[PDB]
């Protein structure tokens, strides 16, 4: 019951590539935070083919750890790691990635 957690949201709506099994350690922890976790996560796959316009309950499995829909979002101008002239006149401005 992991391929229904990695595949849950999208490529674009989240990391296009994998979590790199950092969700296979999330899923274990969501078992303890929610016993019914592995139950609803299947039920949110067919419904995109109520269920969170007010039921924000599954955002917590999409917020998180930071996972700000992330090793981060915008790494081409900032640090957490990069080379000593990190300064290069700020590079780009809003050319996303």
């Amino acid at each position: 019951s992991i391929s229904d957690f990695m595949q849950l949201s999208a490529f674009a709506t989240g990391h296009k590539n994998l979590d790199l099994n950092i969700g296979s350690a999330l899923l274990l922890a969501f078992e303890a935070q929610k016993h019914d976790f592995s139950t609803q996560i299947k039920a949110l796959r067919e419904h995109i083919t109520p269920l969170h316009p007010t039921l924000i309950q599954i955002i917590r499995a999409w917020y998180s750890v930071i996972e700000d829909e992330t090793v981060y979002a915008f790494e081409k101008a900032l640090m957490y790691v990069v080379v000593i002239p990190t300064y290069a006149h700020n590079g780009p401005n809003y050319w996303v990635s």
Binding site: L20, I22, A25, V81, V82, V83, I84
Partner: protein
């Protein structure tokens, strides 16, 4: 500049004659380590009471090419006189101008070579020298190879003495000419094989990669550390570009001399993609010290200041003897007064002092995930390096038990006469 200067630059004749950077160059005091002990190098400035101001052309040449001090004793073979022997008699007097005219006399005593058991008696070296066949008919410019190649055999062998650190030694601590430029461990470090062997040398290195390594010491697949950091920043970088092209040419011509069990040239050994799980863990205990400058995938920085651990000639060697010195002492070059440095991680380290066990794990992780997976580090392959490498089979003689036993056994032959 001056021709006499150029030879000392090429001959590296100041890497040994000034203790540390801060010393007064050509003054002596750099105690080069050795199995026998810590020989202390001697003043060479033309000082009339301390240096070699009293030396003449024939007294100089005997020292340089035959290792005989002025008053008669034998100079210790810490000299590359076995590499300086074949030097032309013209260049030997060219050095002579530079030392007598160019450099500035300095008035200081130079600490003397305090050696243990009989290695402390100098005169026996003439017995040693004849065993090492070091008299070699000074260099005559060959003709079947163009002057670009001739200089290469003249810089690699005589002037810069690449061998005196690279080519291994025999039981009697003498040059071992069967494996010529094939790589013996040098105290702590280990000079890698630099023959033309494709998967086991530098014959696979790109030509413009090999020139770029020697000139500066920085390249994508190899960064010079240790005794090359002391050789590149002291001699090679100052050589005019035409000279290195000779060394580059000759290095391509040396016959290959292979290694025990290699499968890919040291700089192609790509690494498994893995990471750790966000002490006592090669995957964590690396990410908590090494992953800040490099990255978690070992690929390094994005422009090169932090070398990629993947496909690195210090990782991808079957002998991890270098990669344990690089962790233990860090790397410290200075080319064009831009020093690139890596903190030491040894016992007396100052950024983070790792333990003799811990370095192995990180050394063992890097090898498994980036280096030759066949090549591995035991927890005590590191204590050897911190001590100075495995004892060559001659230093065993310098412990009083090993001689006392040779004493009575030696005397017991006297009674056998009767």
């Amino acid at each position: 500049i001056s021709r006499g200067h150029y030879l000392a630059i090429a001959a590296d004749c100041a890497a040994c004659h000034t203790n540390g950077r801060d010393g007064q160059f050509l003054a002596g005091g750099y105690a080069i380590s050795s199995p026998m002990g810590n020989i202390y190098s001697t003043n060479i400035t033309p000082s009339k009471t301390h240096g070699i101001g009293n030396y003449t052309l024939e007294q100089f040449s005997k020292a340089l090419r035959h290792g005989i001090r002025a008053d008669g004793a034998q100079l210790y073979p810490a000299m590359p006189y076995d590499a300086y022997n074949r030097l032309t008699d013209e260049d030997v007097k060219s050095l002579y101008a530079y030392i007598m005219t160019e450099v500035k006399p300095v008035d200081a005593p130079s600490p003397k070579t305090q050696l243990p058991f009989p290695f402390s008696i100098r005169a026996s070296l003439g017995i040693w020298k004849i065993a090492a066949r070091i008299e070699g008919k000074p260099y005559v410019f060959d003709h079947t190879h163009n002057d670009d190649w001739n200089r290469g055999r003249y810089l690699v062998d005589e002037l810069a003495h690449c061998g005196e650190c690279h080519t291994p030694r025999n039981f009697l601590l003498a040059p071992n000419q069967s494996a010529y430029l094939a790589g013996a461990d040098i105290g702590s470090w280990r000079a890698p094989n630099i023959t033309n062997a494709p998967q086991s040398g530098i014959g696979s290195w790109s030509d413009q990669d090999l020139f770029q390594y020697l000139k500066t010491g920085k390249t994508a697949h190899a960064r010079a550390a240790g005794p090359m950091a002391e050789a590149i920043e002291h001699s090679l970088q100052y050589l005019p570009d035409a000279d290195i092209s000779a060394i580059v040419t000759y290095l391509r011509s040396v016959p290959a001399k292979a290694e025990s069990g290699q499968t890919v040239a040291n700089f192609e050994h790509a690494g498994r993609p893995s990471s750790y799980s966000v002490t006592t863990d090669g995957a964590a205990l690396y990410e908590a010290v090494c992953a800040s400058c490099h990255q978690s995938d070992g690929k390094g920085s994005k422009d090169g200041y932090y070398p990629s651990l993947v496909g690195n000639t210090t990782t991808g060697q079957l002998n991890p003897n270098d990669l344990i010195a690089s962790i233990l002492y860090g790397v410290d070059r200075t080319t064009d007064n831009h020093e690139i440095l890596m903190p030491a991680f040894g016992p007396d380290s100052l950024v983070q002092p790792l333990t003799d066990e811990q370095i192995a794990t990180i050394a063992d992780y890097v090898l498994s995930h980036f280096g030759n997976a066949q090549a591995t580090v035991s927890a005590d392959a590191v204590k050897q390096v911190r001590a100075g490498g495995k004892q060559v089979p001659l230093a065993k003689l310098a412990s009083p038990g090993v001689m006392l036993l040779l004493g009575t056994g030696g005397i017991l032959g006297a009674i056998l006469v009767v």
